[PDB]
Design a protein around this ligand. Structure first.
Ligand SMILES: Nc1nc2c(ncn2[C@@H]2O[C@H](COP(=O)(O)OP(=O)(O)O)[C@@H](O)[C@H]2O)c(=O)[nH]1
Ligand SMILES: [Ca+2]
Length: 178
């Protein structure tokens, strides 16, 4: 093995990242780390009281697994170098959530800061565009990251969007040789 480069596939559900990764990768090596998460409840029956008298049923709810899902998130974000930042072309809320998640991004130290790529998936379905290129190109100009109209169905821009991901990382690693 040459180098270990860790890439993350980000974006809101149904946008196609799992699909995007499946056909690109070409292999069946796929280690999973899965935890359990849940919510639950308990009931109590109390009388509540000139003072009217009411039979009251209290459902009191609780979350479980909570902390594991943070050790899970951390595990996912650790030593990350490249961000597959995709939205849906047929969904403007996928661009909205992206813009607001990029807006809340508290930028860290330069060489420690992961590279990012804005990706627009589902371009094989243009009859359903809620998305305008020049109204996405601004956001990727506001940040200085490339953009690809990709589709995990046709395979459009699939390789060159990931191969372009290395370039930025290797060119980041050039500055801090280590
Ligand atoms: N036509 C089309 N369908 C897609 C594309 N990407 C994903 N899908 C469909 O979206 C469904 C769910 O996508 P998925 O990969 O699970 O979304 P994820 O949870 O963000 O990873 C799948 O059944 C795919 O058929 C795309 O680029 N084009
Ligand atoms: Ca999925």
């Amino acid at each position: 093995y040459d180098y270990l480069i860790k890439l993350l596939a980000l974006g809101d559900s149904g946008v196609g990242k799992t699909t995007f990764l499946y056909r690109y990768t070409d292999n069946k090596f796929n280690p999973k780390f899965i935890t359990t998460v849940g919510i639950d409840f308990r009931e109590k029956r109390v009388v509540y009281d000139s003072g009217k008298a009411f039979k009251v049923h209290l459902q009191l709810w609780d979350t479980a697994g909570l902390e594991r899902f943070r050790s899970l998130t951390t595990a996912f974000f650790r030593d990350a170098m490249g961000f597959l930042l995709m939205f849906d072309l047929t969904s403007q809320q996928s661009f909205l959530n992206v813009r607001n998640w990029m807006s809340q991004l508290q930028a860290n130290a330069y060489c420690e800061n992961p590279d990012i790529v804005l990706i627009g998936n589902k371009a094989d379905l243009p009859d359903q565009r809620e998305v305008n290129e020049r109204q996405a190109r601004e956001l990727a100009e506001k940040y200085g990251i490339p953009y690809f109209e990709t589709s995990a169905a046709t395979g459009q821009n699939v390789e060159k969007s990931v191969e372009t991901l290395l370039d930025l990382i290797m060119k980041r690693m050039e500055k801090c040789v280590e």
